Write an enzyme that holds these catalytic residues in place. Structure first.
Site, PDB file in Angstrom:
ATOM      1  N   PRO A  35       0.817  -1.200   0.000  1.00  0.00           N
ATOM      2  CA  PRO A  35       0.000   0.000   0.000  1.00  0.00           C
ATOM      3  C   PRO A  35       0.873   1.283   0.000  1.00  0.00           C
ATOM      4  O   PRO A  35       0.803   2.112   0.924  1.00  0.00           O
ATOM      5  CB  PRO A  35      -0.801  -0.151   1.297  1.00  0.00           C
ATOM      6  CG  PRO A  35       0.127  -0.842   2.242  1.00  0.00           C
ATOM      7  CD  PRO A  35       0.980  -1.763   1.367  1.00  0.00           C
ATOM      8  N   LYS A  36       1.697   1.452  -1.021  1.00  0.00           N
ATOM      9  CA  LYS A  36       2.763   2.453  -0.945  1.00  0.00           C
ATOM     10  C   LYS A  36       2.357   3.825  -1.428  1.00  0.00           C
ATOM     11  O   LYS A  36       1.565   3.963  -2.371  1.00  0.00           O
ATOM     12  CB  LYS A  36       4.019   1.989  -1.700  1.00  0.00           C
ATOM     13  CG  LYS A  36       4.760   0.824  -1.009  1.00  0.00           C
ATOM     14  CD  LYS A  36       5.730   0.149  -1.986  1.00  0.00           C
ATOM     15  CE  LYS A  36       6.765  -0.708  -1.267  1.00  0.00           C
ATOM     16  NZ  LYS A  36       7.690  -1.401  -2.250  1.00  0.00           N
ATOM     17  N   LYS A  37       2.906   4.841  -0.761  1.00  0.00           N
ATOM     18  CA  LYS A  37       2.764   6.230  -1.201  1.00  0.00           C
ATOM     19  C   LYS A  37       4.140   6.880  -1.271  1.00  0.00           C
ATOM     20  O   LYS A  37       5.148   6.261  -0.910  1.00  0.00           O
ATOM     21  CB  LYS A  37       1.861   6.988  -0.257  1.00  0.00           C
ATOM     22  CG  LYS A  37       0.376   6.736  -0.449  1.00  0.00           C
ATOM     23  CD  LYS A  37      -0.408   7.407   0.681  1.00  0.00           C
ATOM     24  CE  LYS A  37      -1.847   6.929   0.665  1.00  0.00           C
ATOM     25  NZ  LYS A  37      -2.546   7.408   1.865  1.00  0.00           N
TER      26      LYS A  37
END
EC number: 4.1.1.4
Lengths: 244, 244, 244, 245, 244, 244, 244, 244
Positions: free
Chosen positions: A115-117
């Site tokens: 779930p990368k930002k």
């Protein structure tokens, strides 16, 4: 370049120059600061997807340096991990990450479902203190600190930690906005070699941010802090529950 | 966070704080610099995935400012677009983009299937010259230049170009690395308002990069330059061909 | 805490968050520049405390990097040591030392009784030259230079020198300013693993300072310069002579 | 340098060039900002060593400028002091202190047993606000603010705190790591001349740090703020309890 | 300093403080980026001195880091190398180098006869991209780029390339300007340890310079890119052909 | 390009793009600061090669600006020169130089046999003082000062100074490390035109350095200082004693 | 300010404070770098206005320093000049200039009819290399390089080149946009003194610009480079052909 | 001026050059970030002046840009407003306000009785995040964040909120320090034209300050975040309650 050649070369966008490559994914000299804190159990329950089940009401807050990473380059990462159980197995759920390099961010999301930002993590020793920080734009959202290598930690216990399954909710929209991929993914880090591993006093402070809401799992009490350096391979994940 | 909440709520990762919101995706005051150049037809054929067919052997090189973008923010883009036909209909094909803002990068890739990577596009007037540049880390890979609003353009004709279908090849990997999504996607820009549109002399220089291969389509001769400002809605795409 | 548990817990101030931890004190990749120089015999005799005995009239001036030091962090050190005998046994005496990190400064002083002050040592390769410097505030008081790794150094002589006894004069005042601790302390560096060791031509200039009097042992003639990298354990000391 | 002369010369290491000198320790134009805040009583009793006892559940948070300090130089200091009683006599206990100058740091620890660590305290007027701050390396662990000299204080009352005893737990390890010194020390600030004293509204915020845990004593409510300038002599301490006798 | 001391002591100028020491010349952690490109065979023929014969019409363009070099220090190099045969044996020919450190420049030239000039090479990871650059004063003359460790390379084969002879044309003028030394020199890199070796996409751009003519061998097509780290010994060369 | 073409074009490495050119070597507006000091006669004898013979125990320490130099460009130089006698002729011996430009450094060494190393010399007027400095990396090794043009000096005597022979020990190793060239070289500066020449109070300070040991000829007493500006030609040298 | 004062006083605008003065226009110490290159004869023909006729298919690319210019000041110029014949006489044609000072730009254009635009030319020695560059706002459009005074040039021949006629096409618009002046102008540089003149290897790189199209005459092969310093008078031009 | 004309002319100090002008006070493109948060009811009750009555226990924290403000200039504003009723009528109360421009600060205080202090508010888009900050000298005391334009906001609710009554407590001391003015003032923003209005997720952190006590109304829970741009007229107030 014919239809079947397309289908055959297709791995990641852009077709002819993929945003990321195939692995294997090997990491040399990964350096972790992990601060584990007790939080509101109601704060985990609001964010943990069934059929995952809550274990302890703790959060692993992490700051990782990845100076040498195949396919990806040299980067750093920060994130919130929660202990869970799934089908009698202990493991972790990744709720949120932030990285400063593109290929592992697109790759992380599109292949495994991390779930990368985007963000600016850092992990460096300033004289006597190991200091972890994560900025999101001009705003500081996490600051951790640890004493320097006070005590050696159990390496057997650490390897058992790195052997447990790591679960991710992979979601990718269809062109119309409805999910095309929605599944629980299990991945393992294998071929681990621990170069050093320590514990020491630790601390954590988190700040609210609308688009990086790490602060919504409040730090009620810091429980533990560990710092280790290791090599490993991030193996491809496997689907363990397909919501679709 | 019940199981069927997940499959009805799921839009983008992280499920509870999605990396980009649903639209409509509205853009106010997009500003374009487009340098149209003739290239080697053989370089086009090498990258064009059938059933798309090449048309003129030209590239539309874009530098675009998007200062006001719903859900995405304020940012810039650069990229390579090629005239194409699909089942005889004239449209475009986006070969390569580069952007300086994560939500539209992830969102572009995961929703429509824009072939987006990171980079640092800029578009600025320096006294007498509109200057577009694209840097990929420390390397300049594209520099374009235009005189400033030499002559008004036929807007009704422009709006015509902007009604054409835009085609994308969407590729998402399955957890095991084989393609999970591999499809041609058609999208339109709608509710267009042209605020102004001009022509003027143009220049374009490209530089090689292992990871940003824009120079693979060589600038043999620059044919035209256009500069325009508009508001528009990026509508959701449709699948027009599924390779899987 | 209960009066009894205070005694049981007490190690260093602050009681509840000690300025430095217990150890063991492990050093990884210490890097030394040592310049041995002949000085005035009278200058040495004037500072050496009986029952310590003068051996040859040389000073080993050290510039040390300690990038990885358990409990202490990452820091640098510079100062003066003199070849000594005590009861017939050949060893060394530490006259002056300078550091840029506080935990090893307090801990060095309070535990072993290293004669430490604050300062800013550096040891760095500039192209073809290994350059050691010590500033004390705005004043440079030591500058050392060596060529880079001209010849391998005898590992056996090196290991024997590192196996020698080191003596320190531990002094700690009682609250009335009279000596509460005043003793000769013997300590050893053990578990020594040398990673590399070289000789090359070397230089040293020293400068006057009222609070950092290294120059009081004048450089008559530079005899040798050694460069080495090693891992070692700084073992606890033992009292060999109590003045009180 | 005979062994007899060694014992006579010995005050502080290095023998022939001591890290600090002997006093008297005189302070001229020492400037204080003290924010007093109520904390969790449970937080105080955890850190207070018996035979000390707890008095009111407050912390006196301090930012001090010492521009003129005999034997030490020019430096700043910040830290945490709590109200205490020993044998029913009311006094202060210093929990933590942080300074930017080594001589008073080493001297502070090795002579009196002040619980000192390195840090970067600052105290400065910014237009209308007195602003005190503490950084530990890259991290801010304390920010305090006050109005500028809103109300004069009576000085005669102030001197009521400055004549009180101050208590310190002195701990010096033996070479083997077990305590060589483990005693409570009593010191007084004498020769106190007050140049001015004031009150004004105050604020304090504290941040966590693994190696500087000021925030372990939480700021529940700020109760008072005081600002004063003085001359002061820091007297040598006396042992009043020796855990090791 | 007697007359026959001079002729038995003489190694390099200044006699009493030579500009570089004798070896062995040991290199730890050399890091290579090599972009192999096809060029105009006629540009190769124009520079290749007989009895050397050209092989493939390719150039190996190098950017090399040498952080730990006995007698020389810590530095970087860039250069142009061409496959060659001499008396039928396959080897290399070094056409041009550039370095940022004097001892290896003088030493390279005066001992082996490496064709060294000054310049400012750099080799650095910038997030996802290994970037080599070469500046000659204020002018950029070479920029190379590579993805980061896309795939492991066959090391046994690599070590094979590194066993081949390297050929140099050594030229030293007599005081009157006619050649005093003019010879082909053969040298090997020995005691090689490969620490890692990778392949990934590559790019190379060269720019003209009157005094650094690398662009005289034009990049027609890039063929491969290799990245590797090693320790090695630069052995002394032998004369294989003396023109005089 | 055949064997004899190689032998015929060979002047300096690289063959096809020499690191330096042929002359003539013409200097316009050379500016000298020369400080002459008395030193230890034993310090000269340790460094002067027979059959050169010591004259006065003095050293000429020099700082030279060469803003306009054919073939070489714009640069500065600093060095130590010793008066000698050879076969009844007065002249000088150059022990050490340092320059900030490549071509004259390689050229100086390989053609004439100047004992040159790299450094940063400067010579500039700061208000009332002419200040000469030489750094070697971050380390200051020489600082000279002079009053500004106090007295005109004898131009006949100066021209006689610039007319004397200048001797150099030229040493170039063979590929195997043994000397291939080891000879005393005589050179003259001719076509001198003096633009101005002065004396004034002067001063010199030298600092030790392992790789630039100008300080090993100690400044016991400053004797004289001269400052002049001139044009000249550095003529090719001739061998006057071949040690080989 | 009477009516016939105006028509007898009028030289340049503003009438009462003219943007440039009348000459003579004297230049002391102009310094030239001229890179002569062969280009596409078809690119020359495309820009050459008849009755001018092309000669060799070469371009003289100039970078010129004018530190001392009567009425104009201290400034730099860069430009493209082509060999031409008019009515059989050999001369030059100035296609493009760029300068960093307004009076000579307006004056050049309005008096002679030099085709001047703004830009930032520089000509500087950087150690061993004469470097000319031309920037137009933030874009580099020309970089030239030369070795430094490799060989003296035949001055009498040079002075010959400088006696040739220089031709300009002067164009001034009438207020309505049709040409008010459109003529070929012949001008000479007179009273020339050559202070020095040299040859050395040369390089030239050009970059596209919409508003500074120097790259329209492509550098196919560099033929020569000249560097010279002179004083000269720019005489007033004459009309040799009036298109109107 | 005559005593009579003084009364006739008097508006604000200085009489002859008033610190702020009369108006009307027209605002063009005000841009607001408002974060509504639930706080402690008791904190509100402690500051609200009867006859004012508390409505719900929320605080609207505002960050406002006023780029175009007649008579005032271009400036920014931050502070706290609370929902209120007065005689049954729903409105707002302004507790604290902070500005970086003096004319609207004096004029705000002296004319309407806005409770203004000095400070440095900023409101800016950083890529994907709208970031509001308020510094008071060197101390940050408020940081707000929102996503960028996720959803259109109900224009009707917005316009009704802007049409509400605003109450202020005007206090002005008499020269003896006793209140000369002490009144509830009601004012309206009219001629409101909203240009855009959105919602998005939002955050707020507040910090302690002795002279800027915003933190005294603690952020228990952020309820909503609105972003809007509009034109409006700040109408003169009217007294609704006189304490005196």
């Amino acid at each position: 370049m014919k239809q079947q050649e397309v289908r055959q070369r297709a791995f990641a966008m852009p077709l002819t120059s993929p945003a990321f490559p195939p692995g294997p994914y090997r990491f040399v000299n990964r350096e972790y600061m992990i601060i584990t804190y007790r939080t509101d159990p109601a704060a985990i329950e609001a964010v943990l997807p069934e059929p995952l089940q809550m274990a302890e009401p703790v959060v692993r807050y992490e700051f990782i340096r990845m100076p040498d990473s195949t396919g990806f380059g040299d980067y750093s990462e920060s994130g919130q991990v929660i202990p869970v159980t799934f089908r009698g197995e202990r493991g972790s759920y990744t709720l949120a990450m932030f990285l400063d390099d593109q290929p592992p961010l697109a790759g992380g999301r599109e292949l495994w479902g991390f779930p990368k930002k985007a963000g600016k993590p850092r992990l460096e020793v300033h004289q006597d203190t190991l200091v972890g920080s994560l900025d999101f734009g001009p705003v500081r959202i996490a600051t951790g600190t640890m004493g320097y290598k006070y005590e050696a930690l159990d390496r057997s216990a650490l390897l058992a930690s790195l052997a447990e399954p790591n679960f991710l909710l992979k979601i990718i929209p269809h062109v119309d906005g409805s999910p095309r991929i929605c599944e629980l993914v299990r991945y393992h880090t294998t071929d681990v070699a621990i170069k050093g591993a320590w514990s020491a006093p630790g601390s954590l402070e988190l700040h609210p941010h609308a688009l990086a809401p790490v602060a919504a799992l409040p730090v009620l009490e810091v429980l533990s802090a560990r710092h280790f350096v290791c090599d490993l391979t991030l193996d491809l994940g496997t689907v363990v529950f397909d919501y679709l």
